[PDB]
What does this fold into?
Amino acid sequence: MINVQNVSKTFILHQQNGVRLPVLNRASLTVNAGECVVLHGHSGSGKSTLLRSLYANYLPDEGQIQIKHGDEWVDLVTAPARKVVEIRKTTVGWVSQFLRVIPRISALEVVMQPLLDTGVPREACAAKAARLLTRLNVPERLWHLAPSTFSGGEQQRVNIARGFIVDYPILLLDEPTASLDAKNSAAVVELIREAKTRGAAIVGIFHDEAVRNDVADRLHPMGA
Amino acid sequence: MINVQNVSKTFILHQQNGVRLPVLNRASLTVNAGECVVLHGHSGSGKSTLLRSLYANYLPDEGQIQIKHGDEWVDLVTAPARKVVEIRKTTVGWVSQFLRVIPRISALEVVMQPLLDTGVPREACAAKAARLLTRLNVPERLWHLAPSTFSGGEQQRVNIARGFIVDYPILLLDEPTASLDAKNSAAVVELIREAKTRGAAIVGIFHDEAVRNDVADRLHPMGA
Amino acid sequence: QPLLSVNNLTHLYAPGKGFSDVSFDLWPGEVLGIVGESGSGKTTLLKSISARLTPQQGEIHYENRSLYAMSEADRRRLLRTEWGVVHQHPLDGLRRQVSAGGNIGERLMATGARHYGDIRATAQKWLEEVEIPANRIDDLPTTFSGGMQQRLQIARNLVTHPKLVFMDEPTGGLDVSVQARLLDLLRGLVVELNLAVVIVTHDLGVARLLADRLLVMKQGQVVESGLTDRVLDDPHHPYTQLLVSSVLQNENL
Amino acid sequence: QPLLSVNNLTHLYAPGKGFSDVSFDLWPGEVLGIVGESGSGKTTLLKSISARLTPQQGEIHYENRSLYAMSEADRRRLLRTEWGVVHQHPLDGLRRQVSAGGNIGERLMATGARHYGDIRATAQKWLEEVEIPANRIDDLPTTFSGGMQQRLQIARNLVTHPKLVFMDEPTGGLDVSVQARLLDLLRGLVVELNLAVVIVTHDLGVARLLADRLLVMKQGQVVESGLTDRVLDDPHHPYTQLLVSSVLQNENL
Ligand SMILES: Nc1ncnc2c1ncn2[C@@H]1O[C@H](COP(=O)(O)OP(=O)(O)OP(=O)(O)O)[C@@H](O)[C@H]1O
Ligand SMILES: Nc1ncnc2c1ncn2[C@@H]1O[C@H](COP(=O)(O)OP(=O)(O)OP(=O)(O)O)[C@@H](O)[C@H]1O
Ligand SMILES: Nc1ncnc2c1ncn2[C@@H]1O[C@H](COP(=O)(O)OP(=O)(O)O)[C@@H](O)[C@H]1O
Ligand SMILES: Nc1ncnc2c1ncn2[C@@H]1O[C@H](COP(=O)(O)OP(=O)(O)O)[C@@H](O)[C@H]1O
Ligand SMILES: [Mg+2]
Ligand SMILES: [Mg+2]
Ligand SMILES: [Mg+2]
Ligand SMILES: [Mg+2]
It folds into this structure.
């Protein structure tokens, strides 16, 4: 469950004469469990800005971003950083194009870590990580190697597997399949479908027409 | 003038069981002054690998890469690093998608620096940098600001201007216009045409059909 | 309730030197990053909150006990058995004339360890944890390189599994590989043992990968604070924008 | 002819501690970065090539004069007027009981400067060059932060416009903004005044932006060398691959 009400965000560039760069204007949005809403617009419209605000990576200047943390409504625009941290731990999951991990950790451990932080037994986490990596057709030979030593597609697939290791009630996606081929994109679409089936409120940004049509349930115009 | 003879390059990934990743196999190529050769192939064929070998950023395992440094033939595969440094200073120029500069230096100084390092008077360097920035339609308000504070397109245009500040006899291009719009891409194509007219041996990698057709004079198949 | 609570803390050597009116909380299993300009008061603040510099104003509460209202004996007991302190200069946190093994084992013996063989084995294991060869155990820190001294100090201050570790630029003098080893070690300790960390760093990559929150300090004042990613990716203060823009960008091949 | 020429240089405290069989050249207007594992012998090598540690084997030639065949007086004259040395620990390169102004002005007076006002003005200008407020000129380095001490040492060793500067991790303790200021300063000095630099660093970004060539050191041996971009982007040695893979990747928004 997501309820975004009147979120506006201007970027102030103090490094260049403090010019204002409005991006979001009284943006509103609502997402139900098991529903997927895809942001639609041109480059620079503010899709990533809104998606990052939903993840609290950006701080909307005005407005409310209410999420269902367990059985409570939490406003990200005003929640203490500690509440946001726990929300990300359990409630809101994020998948994007770049994998930000500690370098010398193996891919399997990288994928397992978000679920281990939740206290799940190590064996279960390893089994689920292996399942996810196999689904995204990541060779087993790469499981016990650091992601930084792989290609871009393999690293992105490891990032996606890490994103799907925890069954987040709320999921945010930013071009997860952009660099993936047909089979990998289909596997990611299947993962998104399964996550939606279990009751995940999904907000995504997709550029491929086929992927959006397969996955998207509602379209949010980002032009205004 | 460029003469690449039998350049093969395998990458050895010691971080993953030391697996070999052949990329270039006895690649051969020749470029004349005033001629532009564009590498053609699919992603992962080895276009960037060959272009970087021509710039000495990669070290071909076997083969020769002879360039006309002044009135001498220099093999990059065996030249001392000092010789390659001076070659880059005067002979071989490089333009790519990423601007690697010291952070807090203004864009104008960033563009001027390669020509200043050649001993050209500061006023002439500033005039030429202003000319290049105006041609690539970079607003004057951004000239005295650090590139890191700009958008991707503006940063790429500043990078291109820095690349064209010195009239390199040999020019290497890696997707210079990928992130640029129609007008900026046309300006870059005009710059490439002017550089070719003055007698520049240009080797480029282009993905846009229109840009390649406008600029390319010969096609080098990278499939084998 | 916060493990550490800092309210209106101030300590100024002079009008601008040090820190003024600093407030923040810390909980278990959390990492407070402190970044900012060299000479902004980060080391001064770290000393003050680690029971090494009496503040002129404000209060520090540890487990709901005022830090500087306690006896000196209680503060030293905390710093011996409960806390860890990693100094900006590694030798300041080491005994110059005591071997690396002794430097590590002092802390263990302070926690009641009284078996020499077990202490030595733990010291060797922690030397291998920070990628210092175990055959350097009996060498003095003066024979260590700067990074080796840094890692010895870290091992000494982590061996007792403290509830709270203050660190001043712990990655100084460390190569990127051993830096990654250290980051993994600290992250694992934080997640598993619920260790809390206050880390001053100038490497924004380490802050991003390790800190849950950040404080940004300029001229002794916290000019920005919040979630690490928000501070680094959506900075509001001009100085934070300048700092993030000064980061050396890397490229992917 | 190379400004500095190092042939088969070796100095080992023990079998593996130090450096062995190191050879390289350096010319004017060039930067030789040195990267590698903490404890690999980088500081030892920097001391040896800077006339501070007599090698067991090999030769160092400066302007075609053997470095350690010269008299001690000649070596000290070089280190006073011709060379600059930036130590890994900044205080090791500073006079603790001498003000920052005096620390900078010692070098100027060593080059024949004998006007107090001009020396003080130059010291203030160089303090502002490294973003140290000019009103700290009369303060002792003990009152400086670690990064402030580092920058004071750099200013002291650059004020005389030396032909050759050895630096051990000069960016240690520096925020990214002042680090960028320092990188620009050094690059400008190198390009304009033809300054030559041998810089040991663990920040591969600084090496990439500054070093014209690189030496990768592991366990006292140069395992890889050549063009900086080639070494970092096309590493051949396994250790260099591991090092580059350990770099903390950043993202562009
Ligand atoms: N952290 C930031 N600081 C400054 N400007 C920003 C920041 N993030 C975004 N912007 C700018 O705000 C506008 C919004 O860009 P944004 O990335 O949201 O667009 P988008 O095309 O929808 O994204 P994406 O392609 O990632 O889906 C653009 O001008 C972008 O340059
Ligand atoms: N430094 C490197 N280390 C390891 N593998 C590399 C390196 N550079 C390239 N490769 C791999 O070698 C092959 C060549 O890729 P390359 O980037 O040359 O292809 P390309 O599609 O022609 O390039 P570009 O899109 O930049 O024009 C790919 O497998 C790439 O992953
Ligand atoms: N003993 C002292 N006497 C006077 N001033 C000091 C002393 N120690 C530190 N300072 C000053 O206080 C300020 C804060 O120093 P510090 O906290 O070490 O900075 P940083 O955040 O870089 O560690 C600095 O400007 C420094 O000059
Ligand atoms: N005085 C000394 N006595 C014995 N060993 C030393 C001494 N100084 C340094 N070493 C050893 O020599 C090696 C090289 O040290 P150093 O050159 O400082 O490493 P780094 O490259 O990290 O600066 C290290 O392993 C260190 O333990
Ligand atoms: Mg975007
Ligand atoms: Mg490529
Ligand atoms: Mg400090
Ligand atoms: Mg050292």
User: Anything to note?
Assistant: Residues 51 and 72 of chain D are 9 Å apart (CA to CA). The first helix of chain D runs from residue 42 to 49. DSSP finds nine helices and ten strands in chain D.
